[PDB]
Design an enzyme around this catalytic site. Structure first.
Site, PDB file in Angstrom:
ATOM      1  N   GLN A 124      38.665  47.815  20.246  1.00  0.00           N
ATOM      2  CA  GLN A 124      38.572  49.238  20.531  1.00  0.00           C
ATOM      3  C   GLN A 124      37.232  49.473  21.226  1.00  0.00           C
ATOM      4  OE1 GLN A 124      36.588  52.806  20.381  1.00  0.00           O
ATOM      5  NE2 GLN A 124      36.228  51.488  18.608  1.00  0.00           N
TER       6      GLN A 124
ATOM      7  N   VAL B  46      49.995  57.318   8.451  1.00  0.00           N
ATOM      8  CA  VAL B  46      50.921  56.293   7.969  1.00  0.00           C
ATOM      9  C   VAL B  46      50.438  55.783   6.611  1.00  0.00           C
ATOM     10  CG1 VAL B  46      51.927  54.028   8.412  1.00  0.00           C
ATOM     11  CG2 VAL B  46      51.584  55.629  10.314  1.00  0.00           C
TER      12      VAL B  46
ATOM     13  N   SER C  16      47.489  59.360  19.104  1.00  0.00           N
ATOM     14  CA  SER C  16      46.482  59.394  18.072  1.00  0.00           C
ATOM     15  C   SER C  16      45.732  60.715  18.181  1.00  0.00           C
ATOM     16  CB  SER C  16      45.528  58.224  18.213  1.00  0.00           C
ATOM     17  OG  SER C  16      44.495  58.276  17.240  1.00  0.00           O
TER      18      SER C  16
ATOM     19  N   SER D 132      36.713  47.922  15.816  1.00  0.00           N
ATOM     20  CA  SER D 132      35.871  49.025  16.259  1.00  0.00           C
ATOM     21  C   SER D 132      34.657  48.527  17.047  1.00  0.00           C
ATOM     22  CB  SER D 132      35.403  49.816  15.068  1.00  0.00           C
ATOM     23  OG  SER D 132      34.478  50.832  15.441  1.00  0.00           O
TER      24      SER D 132
ATOM     25  N   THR E  35      39.120  54.393  23.720  1.00  0.00           N
ATOM     26  CA  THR E  35      39.221  55.667  23.039  1.00  0.00           C
ATOM     27  C   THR E  35      38.848  56.776  24.024  1.00  0.00           C
ATOM     28  OG1 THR E  35      38.818  54.615  20.954  1.00  0.00           O
ATOM     29  CG2 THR E  35      38.429  57.001  21.050  1.00  0.00           C
TER      30      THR E  35
ATOM     31  N   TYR F 130      34.509  52.114  23.127  1.00  0.00           N
ATOM     32  CA  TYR F 130      33.896  53.357  23.526  1.00  0.00           C
ATOM     33  C   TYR F 130      33.132  53.116  24.825  1.00  0.00           C
ATOM     34  CZ  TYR F 130      34.794  55.774  19.090  1.00  0.00           C
ATOM     35  OH  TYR F 130      35.401  56.414  18.048  1.00  0.00           O
TER      36      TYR F 130
ATOM     37  N   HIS G  38      42.963  60.603  16.275  1.00  0.00           N
ATOM     38  CA  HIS G  38      41.738  60.013  15.730  1.00  0.00           C
ATOM     39  C   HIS G  38      41.683  60.237  14.214  1.00  0.00           C
ATOM     40  CE1 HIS G  38      37.682  58.512  17.368  1.00  0.00           C
ATOM     41  NE2 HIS G  38      37.509  58.487  16.050  1.00  0.00           N
TER      42      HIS G  38
ATOM     43  N   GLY H  50      44.679  53.180   9.519  1.00  0.00           N
ATOM     44  CA  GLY H  50      43.235  53.302   9.450  1.00  0.00           C
ATOM     45  C   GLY H  50      42.746  53.262   8.015  1.00  0.00           C
TER      46      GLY H  50
ATOM     47  N   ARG I   5      32.756  66.730  11.036  1.00  0.00           N
ATOM     48  CA  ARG I   5      33.273  66.414   9.705  1.00  0.00           C
ATOM     49  C   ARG I   5      32.281  67.005   8.701  1.00  0.00           C
ATOM     50  NH1 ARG I   5      33.963  60.814  12.039  1.00  0.00           N
ATOM     51  NH2 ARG I   5      35.143  61.173  13.975  1.00  0.00           N
TER      52      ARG I   5
ATOM     53  N   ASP J  78      49.270  56.233  15.482  1.00  0.00           N
ATOM     54  CA  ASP J  78      48.519  56.196  14.244  1.00  0.00           C
ATOM     55  C   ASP J  78      48.353  57.631  13.743  1.00  0.00           C
ATOM     56  OD1 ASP J  78      46.145  57.277  15.405  1.00  0.00           O
ATOM     57  OD2 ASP J  78      45.252  55.290  15.674  1.00  0.00           O
TER      58      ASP J  78
ATOM     59  N   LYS K 122      43.817  55.248  23.947  1.00  0.00           N
ATOM     60  CA  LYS K 122      43.887  55.658  22.553  1.00  0.00           C
ATOM     61  C   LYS K 122      43.390  57.099  22.413  1.00  0.00           C
ATOM     62  CE  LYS K 122      42.125  54.287  17.976  1.00  0.00           C
ATOM     63  NZ  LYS K 122      41.223  55.413  17.672  1.00  0.00           N
TER      64      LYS K 122
ATOM     65  N   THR L  62      38.538  51.065  12.366  1.00  0.00           N
ATOM     66  CA  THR L  62      37.781  51.939  11.487  1.00  0.00           C
ATOM     67  C   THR L  62      36.355  51.408  11.428  1.00  0.00           C
ATOM     68  OG1 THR L  62      38.626  50.736   9.554  1.00  0.00           O
ATOM     69  CG2 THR L  62      39.689  52.809  10.073  1.00  0.00           C
TER      70      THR L  62
HETATM   71  C1  LIG Z   1      36.739  55.922   8.630  1.00  0.00           C
HETATM   72  C2  LIG Z   1      37.324  55.920  10.005  1.00  0.00           C
HETATM   73  C3  LIG Z   1      36.630  55.314  11.027  1.00  0.00           C
HETATM   74  C4  LIG Z   1      37.154  55.285  12.314  1.00  0.00           C
HETATM   75  N1  LIG Z   1      36.485  54.666  13.313  1.00  0.00           N
HETATM   76  C5  LIG Z   1      37.014  54.618  14.560  1.00  0.00           C
HETATM   77  C6  LIG Z   1      36.349  53.933  15.655  1.00  0.00           C
HETATM   78  O1  LIG Z   1      35.262  53.373  15.448  1.00  0.00           O
HETATM   79  N2  LIG Z   1      36.938  53.939  16.851  1.00  0.00           N
HETATM   80  C7  LIG Z   1      38.100  54.565  17.096  1.00  0.00           C
HETATM   81  O2  LIG Z   1      38.578  54.547  18.246  1.00  0.00           O
HETATM   82  N3  LIG Z   1      38.778  55.205  16.132  1.00  0.00           N
HETATM   83  C8  LIG Z   1      38.288  55.241  14.890  1.00  0.00           C
HETATM   84  N4  LIG Z   1      38.981  55.896  13.892  1.00  0.00           N
HETATM   85  C9  LIG Z   1      40.310  56.434  14.170  1.00  0.00           C
HETATM   86  C10 LIG Z   1      41.301  55.316  13.753  1.00  0.00           C
HETATM   87  O3  LIG Z   1      41.307  54.263  14.739  1.00  0.00           O
HETATM   88  C11 LIG Z   1      42.731  55.823  13.625  1.00  0.00           C
HETATM   89  O4  LIG Z   1      43.042  56.635  14.779  1.00  0.00           O
HETATM   90  C12 LIG Z   1      42.966  56.628  12.353  1.00  0.00           C
HETATM   91  O5  LIG Z   1      42.281  56.059  11.240  1.00  0.00           O
HETATM   92  C13 LIG Z   1      44.451  56.683  12.047  1.00  0.00           C
HETATM   93  O6  LIG Z   1      44.764  57.552  10.962  1.00  0.00           O
HETATM   94  P1  LIG Z   1      44.869  57.093   9.418  1.00  0.00           P
HETATM   95  O7  LIG Z   1      43.465  56.896   8.891  1.00  0.00           O
HETATM   96  O8  LIG Z   1      45.579  58.295   8.839  1.00  0.00           O
HETATM   97  O9  LIG Z   1      45.688  55.839   9.306  1.00  0.00           O
HETATM   98  C14 LIG Z   1      38.459  55.921  12.588  1.00  0.00           C
HETATM   99  C15 LIG Z   1      39.146  56.520  11.547  1.00  0.00           C
HETATM  100  C16 LIG Z   1      38.619  56.551  10.273  1.00  0.00           C
HETATM  101  C17 LIG Z   1      39.386  57.193   9.150  1.00  0.00           C
END
Ligand SMILES: Cc1cc2nc3c(=O)[nH]c(=O)nc-3n(C[C@H](O)[C@H](O)[C@H](O)COP(=O)(O)O)c2cc1C
Ligand SMILES: Cc1cc2nc3c(=O)[nH]c(=O)nc-3n(C[C@H](O)[C@H](O)[C@H](O)COP(=O)(O)O)c2cc1C
Ligand SMILES: Cc1cc2nc3c(=O)[nH]c(=O)nc-3n(C[C@H](O)[C@H](O)[C@H](O)COP(=O)(O)O)c2cc1C
Ligand SMILES: Cc1cc2nc3c(=O)[nH]c(=O)nc-3n(C[C@H](O)[C@H](O)[C@H](O)COP(=O)(O)O)c2cc1C
Lengths: 362, 362, 362, 362
Positions: B130, B294, B258, B108, B158, B132, B260, B314, B167, B291, B236, B80
């Site tokens: 993770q 959860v 995922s 991240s 990712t 990019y 995301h 997350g 968003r 993910d 991912k 995150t």
């Molecule tokens: C605030 C936030 C920031 C995130 N930042 C990234 C990121 O930088 N890189 C990435 O691959 N996924 C990112 N994600 C996706 C998360 O890795 C993950 O897939 C997701 O949070 C899982 O769902 P959950 O929040 O319901 O647990 C982010 C998700 C959230 C909510």
């Protein structure tokens, strides 16, 4: 404090805040208890997307064609009557925005601007005429002939309105045009829907239709129209595969899968739900389009995945007008374009030709 | 009067009460109308549990492994971005909590702490990067090389973010980093997401991605990454079985199912609903993780019953930070651990190896 | 102005208005997010009734038998712990009401009245003991031996509680007994659940279970119990057909299809939904009972149509106590009896023997 | 400011605003938790319409027949007891409105106007008697003989009311007739439901039924009735195909698929959902009718598409009375007629003979 409108729903909320109640209600309403109105939107949500990753979407191309004419995106303006109620410039604003975007405008027979006025405002715009079959076939023919003369490229004949649907708010509000406006394709007080004319004690528009529009029309009238013009003709309002096959047999050039924005018979299915049956029924012989409930880029993607060539939007355009005329319509079309581009990119689609049925599952 | 937070939802409610609106909204939001965001949670509820009685659950063992490394529980911290917005210590707090719990942290690329800083704070913690794919492949390579040097044990690439999802709150709020913070893996004003830099008039992060992240990436870029590092690589963001099979064919070592956190394409299925298709498609050749949504011990149990090796969380982690930094993350992980232990015990499972498909039915 | 309580829901509403919050919450709660708690009720609504007309229902006979003992109706009182929290007379009130109605009472091991006290209050009442397997098997044996000596006619061994479920309100409220009350089947401070004893900082009852109740129990402990007593034994808390078959193989005499009032593992199915699988699995070899969500006469009818011999009610009984002790329990049982009689009559059933599977469809 | 009532729901809202609570509640209520009451309406919404376009609907003909007697529309007035509670003129107002509309009225045995009084008010109206089988068969015979003498054209024998359903509001309100009114087909205080008579402490009507109506009736009593009169007899309240076949075998002339307005056994299916099974079961040997939840023209269309000859409306008629007696009933019937005409026209149906099963899909 200052409008910051970033999606189509925001434009509707703004429109509700600025339009007179009777006008907002006319534009918003569906028929009866509005079951289909809710479903046109809810049904899109039930179709889930299965995006492909790692496809190279640096260059997305949204362009396509409608009945042989190129458009910048598979998102076109559908016929919505009496647009000058939403903004002083009405249909002239709309056509100018379509010209800027490179997409097409379907002009209502019940427009508050004439066929000629709209052509003059948007000479380079792709324009089509939506046609109602009037009891007076000379009126009907004049509309078609004027569309031909003024550079319109197709006729969308509406086939789901032998009578008007029962929109409860319009009855409650005794809907009629504001005093300064008319249906500008017609000369007489009756046919121009003059608000000084006797259209009964319920919805003025329902009474207008009962007086002006022919409830007897049949496939024989489609034969008449097919003989009258060599323009492409699309049947607008088909919901059954058997009717779609009949339209093909009558030499029509497309089907617009439509429940009239859920304003005619309530309790019909959502257009996105009947689209697959219609696509299957016509066997690629004509283009199939959809309208009803398109509000977001993912709606457009889902419709194309299920075999629509393009979609039409109704109410969003009038909310754009209500915000800021031409600029507002431009804004709404640009939001839809950008949402569609993003949806394409995130689902792995570089262009509209690769949007396939495997992208969706209900 | 005094916070008494006993489940993950309580931590979110607390976070909403203490975080600036723009920060809470950034963390909470999904894409567009948030259909998938709701479904990630609702879908877990539709999978019902069929517990076995009288199995002897006096000794429950939650331990497992992820890509060959032992963990205390099948519950790991997902990437995150920009955690220092939630708490001054951000990612350093998170990694210390993971070290205490004996679980892994996925860092991240958009962290507010560097790869090195996080390694120094959690030297004995299981850590993954993770990744990019930046337009600048030298930047991308440097991230990978630093992860290798600093004792990270896998790359989670990712694959669902060629562009950022839309968003709506971030657009409304014109989301950007607080003035004192940066994406600390990068040197330049642009790549560090400086809030003093021009990132347009909408979401700052969407503009950052458009400038920095490569929308052209393809399976050829996966080939490049596979050649670049001998670390285990997990794809991912996969939601289709065909893509999962392609990841296996490219020599990757896992798939993280995922969407995301429902922040990219809205209207994709819930991850728990697509997990079975992906598990079936890879035929045991790589580990499959999940993910998205959860929040409870029973969610973890359901995911493992359907064939996930482990799950990532997350948002719950950032709510832990918002409450009390390291201690708050520790609390959230301990709640999930204890809820999972109880769910295992009540369903007749002594260890993760006996969690079978017969435990669930949709 | 004056309570006029005419259905079970009215009794609950009254109870909420008169009981201390912590006590009402203890009785009302389910586990975690209470998904199963909602479903136990909602599932009954999904089973539709197909009544036969013109069957002659002037004489309805509700009588049946449970494990060979005649009862006035297929509606019996299930074990609910610590009834003196609801009314000073607690379990003594309940057993007297059961005696009056001619139905059976299942007494909780965690009763606020002793096995002997309840037998003395209801000497002619049909009575059964609900048994928990304590770590201390001498305690466990004493409970069984006292039930035998004091004229109890069966043991219902609870098999779904190796640990207590996580009832969030009980954690928030730090649930414990009121100062004047004890679990009266036990002598020591720990086993009597003294509120003066250290049961931690969360739910006192969860800590009590962790200290007192054996999480190791297995089918081997069922073998032990089957050897210990010649009383009929019912396995309470079975939700799987395979477990039901195992109970039959171990020489048990019934299965009570139960999810513990949705208080143990959340996300298990409703009992009415798993009942058909269990009835099919046991092939008529033992009686099958149901509890969970029975509130109305039609619920009873549906359960019997799907093959339950009888149903047990939990929470409704404690709401009866909260209203007016013995008289209140009598009222609740009479309401259920009369609703069941009417449902039988309106569906064409003269007696319980003619309640068939054709009466229901999901 | 002034009532503008344009649909049936508006009439109900008006009725609630003007009727005493106990009277509105009596008319509105269903049995128990009112699950079937909600479903009678919701089920219509699940049946979707598939309209045919371009069929020529300039001339719509709504006329049909019921048991050999011509009616202006397939929409008839069902039996609703004690109509003088809604309006001073009660059943006399209703029959006069039916005469004006050219449709039939089914008169309740529990009418606040006599068989003779209603015949005198509507001599040219199509009229039928709804019959309850009283314990006193001489009373029952007198009702039938008076209907014969006074020009009634059928008997609708109610078969779903051996006892009254449990309508909770009627119990709460201790429902009884207003002091000036009686069930005018009877002479004695008991049988006339005098509100000065002892009908217990709960619903007066439930006690009336228990005293007066025979719960023993069987198919043998149908044999008796079939021998008693040569009038057409319809079985009212059948919900099962097997019962429908039995009615045919007993020489009855129709089935009215009815759950008694959801006022008897709660949790039975919606009538529109069981209608297809009943139509299939009787193999065209008798006419099949529907009541329950008809509020809109599209409901009528759906029922006819699924094979009903005609529908009956209950509550809407009493809301018409509550508004303005005869004129109000006229209004409600005219609204239903016009909504049905529009639904027919918009679906491509010129007359009731062409309303086919292909028009609907669930
Ligand atoms: C605030 C936030 C920031 C995130 N930042 C990234 C990121 O930088 N890189 C990435 O691959 N996924 C990112 N994600 C996706 C998360 O890795 C993950 O897939 C997701 O949070 C899982 O769902 P959950 O929040 O319901 O647990 C982010 C998700 C959230 C909510
Ligand atoms: C306010 C309004 C006016 C309309 N006027 C016409 C019309 O004049 N002719 C026509 O064929 N359809 C008309 N329609 C139907 C639209 O062409 C189109 O089918 C519908 O708006 C699509 O649904 P949408 O509003 O959900 O986008 C109208 C719809 C609305 C909402
Ligand atoms: C307040 C309460 C206390 C309970 N105590 C016990 C108990 O001591 N032993 C047991 O085996 N089950 C216990 N149960 C479960 C009940 O025996 C029964 O399974 C449940 O109440 C049935 O669902 P109902 O409350 O919806 O009727 C309890 C349930 C409740 C609601
Ligand atoms: C207020 C009321 C009174 C009724 N009285 C009778 C009656 O006396 N006899 C009878 O057979 N059915 C009676 N019914 C049932 C109706 O004949 C009919 O089945 C029902 O009203 C149809 O449903 P609807 O109200 O949704 O239109 C009554 C229904 C209502 C709502």
């Amino acid at each position: 404090m200052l409008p910051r409108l970033i999606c189509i729903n925001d434009y509707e909320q703004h429109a509700k805040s600025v339009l007179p109640k009777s006008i907002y209600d006319y534009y918003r309403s569906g028929a009866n208890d509005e079951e289909t109105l809710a479903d046109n939107i809810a049904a899109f949500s039930r179709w889930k997307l299965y995006p492909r990753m790692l496809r190279n979407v640096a260059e997305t191309d949204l362009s396509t064609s409608v009945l042989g004419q190129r458009v910048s995106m598979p998102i076109c303006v559908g016929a919505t009557a009496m647009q000058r109620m939403a903004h002083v410039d009405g249909e002239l604003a709309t056509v100018r925005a379509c010209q800027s975007l490179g997409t097409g405008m379907m002009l209502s027979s019940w427009a508050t601007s004439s066929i000629e006025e709209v052509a003059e405002a948007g000479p380079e715009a792709l324009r089509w005429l939506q046609l109602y079959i009037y009891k007076d076939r000379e009126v009907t023919k004049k509309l078609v002939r004027q569309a031909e003369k003024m550079g319109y490229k197709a006729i969308f004949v509406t086939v789901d309105t032998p009578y008007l649907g029962n929109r409860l708010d319009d009855v409650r509000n005794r809907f009629k045009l504001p005093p300064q406006l008319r249906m500008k394709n017609f000369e007489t007080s009756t046919l121009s829907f003059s608000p000084e004319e006797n259209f009964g004690d319920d919805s003025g528009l329902a009474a207008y239709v009962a007086k002006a529009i022919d409830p007897s029309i049949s496939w024989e009238d489609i034969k008449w129209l097919r003989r009258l013009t060599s323009l492409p003709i699309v049947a607008k309002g088909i919901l059954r595969g058997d009717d779609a096959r009949e339209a093909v047999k009558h030499g029509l050039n497309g089907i617009l899968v439509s429940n009239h924005g859920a304003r005619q018979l309530d309790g019909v299915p959502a257009t996105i739900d009947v689209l697959p049956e219609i696509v299957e029924a016509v066997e690629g012989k004509v283009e199939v389009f959809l309208d009803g409930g398109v509000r977001k880029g993912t709606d457009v993607l889902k419709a194309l995945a299920l075999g629509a060539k393009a979609v039409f939007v109704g109410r969003p355009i009038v909310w754009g007008l209500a915000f800021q005329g031409e600029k507002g319509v431009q804004d709404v079309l640009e939001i839809l374009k950008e949402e569609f581009r993003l949806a394409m990119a995130l689902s792995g689609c570089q262009n509209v030709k690769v949007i396939d049925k495997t992208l969706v599952r209900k």
